[PDB]
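input
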Amino acid sequence: GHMVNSFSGYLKLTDNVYIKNADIVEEAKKVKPTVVVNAANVYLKHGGGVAGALNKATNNAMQVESDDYIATNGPLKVGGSCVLSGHNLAKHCLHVVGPNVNKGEDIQLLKSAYENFNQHEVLLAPLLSAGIFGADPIHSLRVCVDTVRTNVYLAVFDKNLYDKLVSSFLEM
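output
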């Protein structure tokens, strides 16, 4: 009766990368993923964007657990990750820190960030360093496709952005 990692309605971009116009929180509730990726900062302060939406869906349990991890281990490295509980959304949450290009952090660390995905067979994920961190989403998708070899299901909330990413990609 096994309905874990039940992804549907994704467009297959490569052997291992899939994309969908969806809210990652709503996807997590339907799919019951082994791993959901959070686009974190080094402090695991889940204030806005994807981090805030995931944290809100856990009724702040993610922030309480994150605060405990940071009190114990201190801040993450840019390009680094930790595995914590997925709470009510997923078995695990992979918190991954992409570079903040708005603060002149090295865009090369986006490749380090996506390398963390390769330690997990299957992930539900957003694009890293897009939104507040100021990277071009097209660039972020390209680095993802070139770096990740495991099965990644990308949820893109905005329809116009989804359409731009897909047409850009399929051009080649």
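quick obs: The radius of gyration is 15 Å.
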